[PDB]
Paper text:
The structure of retapamulin on the LSU at 1.9 Å reveals a similar binding mode to tiamulin, including the four hydrogen bonds with the 23S rRNA, namely, two from the C21 keto group with G2061 and two from the C11 hydroxyl with the backbone of G2505. While the densities for the core-scaffold of each antibiotic were very well resolved and could be modeled unambiguously, flexibility was evident for parts of some molecules: for example, the C9-moieties of omadacycline, eravacycline and the pentacycline, ring III of apramycin, the β-lysine of capreomycin and the C14-moieties of tiamulin and retapamulin. We note that, with the exception of capreomycin, there is a high prevalence of oxygen over nitrogen atoms in ribosome-targeting antibiotics, which likely explains the preference for oxygen-mediated interactions.
The ribosome is a major target for clinically used antibiotics, but multidrug resistant pathogenic bacteria are making our current arsenal of antimicrobials obsolete. Here we present cryo-electron-microscopy structures of 17 distinct compounds from six different antibiotic classes bound to the bacterial ribosome at resolutions ranging from 1.6 to 2.2 Å. The improved resolution enables a precise description of antibiotic–ribosome interactions, encompassing solvent networks that mediate multiple additional interactions between the drugs and their target.
Residue numbers in the entry:
A (entry chain s): 1 to 93
B (entry chain 1): 1 to 45
C (entry chain E), D (entry chain H), E (entry chain I), F (entry chain F), G (entry chain G): 1 to 6
H (entry chain c): 2 to 272
Write the structure that this text describes.
Amino acid sequence: MIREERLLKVLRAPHVSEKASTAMEKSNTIVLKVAKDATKAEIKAAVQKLFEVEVEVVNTLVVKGKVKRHGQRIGRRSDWKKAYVTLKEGQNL
Amino acid sequence: MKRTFQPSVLKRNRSHGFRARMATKNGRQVLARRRAKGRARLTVS
Amino acid sequence: KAXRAS
Amino acid sequence: KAXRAS
Amino acid sequence: KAXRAS
Amino acid sequence: KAXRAS
Amino acid sequence: KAXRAS
Amino acid sequence: AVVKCKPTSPGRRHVVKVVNPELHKGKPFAPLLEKNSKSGGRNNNGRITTRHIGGGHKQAYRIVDFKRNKDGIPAVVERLEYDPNRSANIALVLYKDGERRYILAPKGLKAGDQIQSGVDAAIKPGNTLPMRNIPVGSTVHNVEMKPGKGGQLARSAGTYVQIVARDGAYVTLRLRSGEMRKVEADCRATLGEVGNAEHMLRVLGKAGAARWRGVRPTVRGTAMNPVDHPHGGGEGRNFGKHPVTPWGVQTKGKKTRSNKRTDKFIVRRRS
RNA sequence: AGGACCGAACCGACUAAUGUUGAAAAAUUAGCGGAUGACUUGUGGCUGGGGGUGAAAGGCCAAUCAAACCGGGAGAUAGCU
RNA sequence: GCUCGCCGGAAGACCAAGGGUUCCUGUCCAACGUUAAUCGGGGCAGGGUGAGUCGACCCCUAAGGCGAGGCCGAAAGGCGUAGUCGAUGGGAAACAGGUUAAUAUUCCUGUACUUGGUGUUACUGCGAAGGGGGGACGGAGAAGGCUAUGUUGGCCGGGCGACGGUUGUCCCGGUUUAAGCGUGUAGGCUGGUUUUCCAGGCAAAUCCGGAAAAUCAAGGCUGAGGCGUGAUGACGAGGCACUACGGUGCUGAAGCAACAAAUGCCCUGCUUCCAGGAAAAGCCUCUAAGCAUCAGGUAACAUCAAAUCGUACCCCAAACCGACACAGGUGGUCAGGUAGAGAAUACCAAGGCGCUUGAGAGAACUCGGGUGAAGGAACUAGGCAAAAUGGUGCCGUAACUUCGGGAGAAGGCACGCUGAUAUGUAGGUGAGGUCCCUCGCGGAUGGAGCUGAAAUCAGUCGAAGAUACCAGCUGGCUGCAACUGUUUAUUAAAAACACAGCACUGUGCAAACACGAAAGUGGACGUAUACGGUGUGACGCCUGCCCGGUGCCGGAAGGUUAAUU
Ligand SMILES: [K+]
Ligand SMILES: [K+]
Ligand SMILES: [K+]
Ligand SMILES: [K+]
Ligand SMILES: [K+]
Ligand SMILES: [K+]
Ligand SMILES: [K+]
Ligand SMILES: [K+]
Ligand SMILES: [K+]
Ligand SMILES: [K+]
Ligand SMILES: [K+]
Ligand SMILES: [K+]
Ligand SMILES: [K+]
Ligand SMILES: [K+]
Ligand SMILES: [K+]
Ligand SMILES: [K+]
Ligand SMILES: [K+]
Ligand SMILES: [Mg+2]
Ligand SMILES: [Mg+2]
Ligand SMILES: [Mg+2]
Ligand SMILES: [Mg+2]
Ligand SMILES: [Mg+2]
Ligand SMILES: [Mg+2]
Ligand SMILES: [Mg+2]
Ligand SMILES: [Mg+2]
Ligand SMILES: [Mg+2]
Ligand SMILES: [Mg+2]
Ligand SMILES: [Mg+2]
Ligand SMILES: [Mg+2]
Ligand SMILES: [Mg+2]
Ligand SMILES: [Mg+2]
Ligand SMILES: [Mg+2]
Ligand SMILES: [Mg+2]
Ligand SMILES: [Mg+2]
Ligand SMILES: [Mg+2]
Ligand SMILES: [Mg+2]
Ligand SMILES: [Mg+2]
Ligand SMILES: [Mg+2]
Ligand SMILES: [Mg+2]
Ligand SMILES: [Mg+2]
Ligand SMILES: [Mg+2]
Ligand SMILES: [Mg+2]
Ligand SMILES: [Mg+2]
Ligand SMILES: [Mg+2]
Ligand SMILES: [Mg+2]
Ligand SMILES: [Mg+2]
Ligand SMILES: [Mg+2]
Ligand SMILES: [Mg+2]
Ligand SMILES: [Mg+2]
Ligand SMILES: [Mg+2]
Ligand SMILES: [Mg+2]
Ligand SMILES: [Mg+2]
Ligand SMILES: [Mg+2]
Ligand SMILES: [Mg+2]
Ligand SMILES: [Mg+2]
Ligand SMILES: [Mg+2]
Ligand SMILES: [Mg+2]
Ligand SMILES: [Mg+2]
Ligand SMILES: [Mg+2]
Ligand SMILES: [Mg+2]
Ligand SMILES: [Mg+2]
Ligand SMILES: [Mg+2]
Ligand SMILES: [Mg+2]
Ligand SMILES: [Mg+2]
Ligand SMILES: [Mg+2]
Ligand SMILES: [Mg+2]
Ligand SMILES: [Mg+2]
Ligand SMILES: [Mg+2]
Ligand SMILES: [Mg+2]
Ligand SMILES: [Mg+2]
């Protein structure tokens, strides 16, 4: 049991890409941007509660932010956590 | 030819890092001087 | 989980 | 932990 | 006495 | 082998 | 070439 | 046996080995092992305080019983062993109660020989008694200087002390140095000489053999520059000064003993 | 067996040529020495400046060494240019 | 795209360190790129890093660091006890195949494994901050057994040849398959089993150590590989069907044997030597106080858990260290073919590259090379440089010598190919069969097949058979230093330093001595056969005279002499 207030903060956005699209069509895996301090257990709990789908497993990685220049002034985008959430077979988001 | 700078992050941090500076009064004086000068980077850390 | 403040 | 050095 | 054990 | 030939 | 010596 | 190597290489020509066939070929007794700490002759300031120390072979320390305080209980010598930590060999002894210890191996003592410590022990080599109970004129080793402290004198290979006199609370000892010294008669000593007397007949034969023993090269003062040593300097080989240590103390005859505390115990200096 | 022998890796640096506003603030090429040892190498550790360390050349101690570097006394002093 | 060339113990591949988006895709060519650039490690945008098992974190310690109290020090601080950190070392577990533009032992498929928590069932002496065991260790060498791997045959599929020949003793390609689970083999180690008892292991112990009996003659521990299963699978030459000419989807033969064979594995072994070769935890075992129809242990089953962080990419380099897209530097791993002793060397494979200015021309001169009439060191400070020698087998080999050496001294002869002996020998390996069989991973015989030196004889080609690459010049006299080493990073490698050996000298242990206002620490967990200092420098023969001077050692009657009074 994680508190719902916590679960309502952990999922930030669906990650849109060719790889994410292929993940959903081939492997029944949604790709999410999640809070940087989100654990696999919290992401699982949140997806099952909020999307109302059975989660099989969560795989996670931290995307390191890119160094970029805006008018010859150097900056760095933020690191963010990606979750590959594999839904149980036949759940279908 | 082998040049003088042979980087090791462990040795860097042990030699010159924040905690090495904080360990002695003279190291804390380095940090005091660098804060007073307004350095963006206090240490190698 | 939330130690940040929740 | 100790006379060995720990 | 001594780090060896004494 | 063996430089003798092998 | 070896075993034999070489 | 003292064995000369054949000159099959120039580093072997002069080698003279002391080969003792009786020493245990196997590993030492693991419960009596500890690690050594190689220093490089550096102290806790990290400074070289004794020059010419470094490298050489890794060595485990054998806990040797110098106190010989397990009185009453006979022990049997199981085996003689090589000890890298000292010139003497050591003997693994088994007490009749099942305790094993190492002792310094006396001259003559072999596997199967019986030893015993205490006031009532027999006067025979390897036995330890208070020097009160050892006959005057006896040859002894591993001699304590304070009662119960453990043997400090005559521990090196082939060494021994003669009990020359007994007067009251003190015995007088002739040490290997030639010094006549008083020790309390309650101090223990082991009868006989320390074994491995052939130790001194070894010839290392090559530079590397000293390196194996953790001895680094001695650089002569006269080979240096004045900044480094009093002897340093000169265009060609020059000297022209009284020989001194690196720290400028005369090193050819000048006496350095200064211990008024222990002067009382010295009957006659080695001279 | 060997601070043994010949010889790659590996460690070194005897000779020559080149190069000398270099490809390189010490190298390249052809030869050269050691190559189971007092060998060599990775990682980490310790020794601090009249101090260290030195198989000793005043060598080495961050391309700096008969006293490192940085900051300060400091605008030292300069009968000299 | 075709051809050509170059690397191939690398100029290939995978990493650590270090870097940090350089990765992939699209787009752009100002600047950056030593030229142009449509290209880029450049600009811009988007994408991309998926783990119970890999690593980190984590448990454990080494050197060493910090260090409550403490000891010490004007202050700052120094040292250090309990502790607590600290890997470069010890400690659980995953493999093959498939897949993305870009990740994969992480995704998918298939098949596994480890540790822990709960719950249940059965049986139960549990219990540590303590004891013991274990972990747990060197160098060298040798040999056997293996595998990786290769080669050949067999098998299967395809081929019948741009120019003579090519249905064959012909050509090309493929012939791959893991962890895990089961089995226990070559090899290695050790006597087993019970009983009684005990000045040891701080207490205790049923454990370990010790002692004495009885009794059996075998048990036990360890272990590569092989074999079986995993696998009716996967993969698979190729063919077919699609093709947006990049590639998709489908279908799929054989898939064996012999021989050779590591530097890898058995092997933390074995043998041998002296210089005598971490620690601590996990782990196993023993009990203590305590718990005592429980807790807890044990096993079985079920069930849940295994988080977090790293994971892109370069990595002998254009991405790291060198100001550069810099001929420099940078630790580990992998190790194909032919020839070869070889990881040398030549040529190749897989794979990767042609080094980010080109085009002409064919002067001097410079650089790097090739050849040279006659002469042959006349050159020059000096044979500097060059030329030369260069392999294997056998024969042969001087002075001198410390008897090892000198020595590869010197010098010489043979060397290719073909045939025969013998269509392939000696040797190695070893099938089926046949015969005993603790009826098996066994022994005995057996030689098919495979591999394969060497010799001799006889032929034969060339100017030349160690044909290339590769690969000692040799000898004589003499100075110095015994020797192998070491050194002026970057003008000196030596005769200098060191060295074994020698001598003098100090040092009785709270050693002398050294680092330290000190506490302490080194010397040394050493103890005069030891340790420090100094000089000399293997070995051989030796090492003479001088103690007046300067030191040092001993003496101390007397002279002189400080504070003090
Ligand atoms: K010397
Ligand atoms: K001198
Ligand atoms: K110096
Ligand atoms: K001199
Ligand atoms: K000089
Ligand atoms: K200085
Ligand atoms: K151009
Ligand atoms: K993990
Ligand atoms: K962690
Ligand atoms: K043809
Ligand atoms: K495995
Ligand atoms: K198997
Ligand atoms: K990866
Ligand atoms: K790396
Ligand atoms: K000479
Ligand atoms: K040299
Ligand atoms: K004199
Ligand atoms: Mg998963
Ligand atoms: Mg992850
Ligand atoms: Mg010395
Ligand atoms: Mg010894
Ligand atoms: Mg020692
Ligand atoms: Mg000496
Ligand atoms: Mg000099
Ligand atoms: Mg001086
Ligand atoms: Mg002179
Ligand atoms: Mg003179
Ligand atoms: Mg050699
Ligand atoms: Mg050098
Ligand atoms: Mg060279
Ligand atoms: Mg040589
Ligand atoms: Mg060699
Ligand atoms: Mg000089
Ligand atoms: Mg320098
Ligand atoms: Mg000065
Ligand atoms: Mg002033
Ligand atoms: Mg001025
Ligand atoms: Mg960028
Ligand atoms: Mg790219
Ligand atoms: Mg341009
Ligand atoms: Mg780019
Ligand atoms: Mg401390
Ligand atoms: Mg720890
Ligand atoms: Mg580690
Ligand atoms: Mg990749
Ligand atoms: Mg095989
Ligand atoms: Mg034709
Ligand atoms: Mg090897
Ligand atoms: Mg990668
Ligand atoms: Mg370039
Ligand atoms: Mg480069
Ligand atoms: Mg290298
Ligand atoms: Mg090569
Ligand atoms: Mg020309
Ligand atoms: Mg020529
Ligand atoms: Mg000519
Ligand atoms: Mg001619
Ligand atoms: Mg001639
Ligand atoms: Mg001439
Ligand atoms: Mg002339
Ligand atoms: Mg020459
Ligand atoms: Mg030449
Ligand atoms: Mg002369
Ligand atoms: Mg020499
Ligand atoms: Mg030499
Ligand atoms: Mg130089
Ligand atoms: Mg030079
Ligand atoms: Mg002491
Ligand atoms: Mg000399
Ligand atoms: Mg004389």
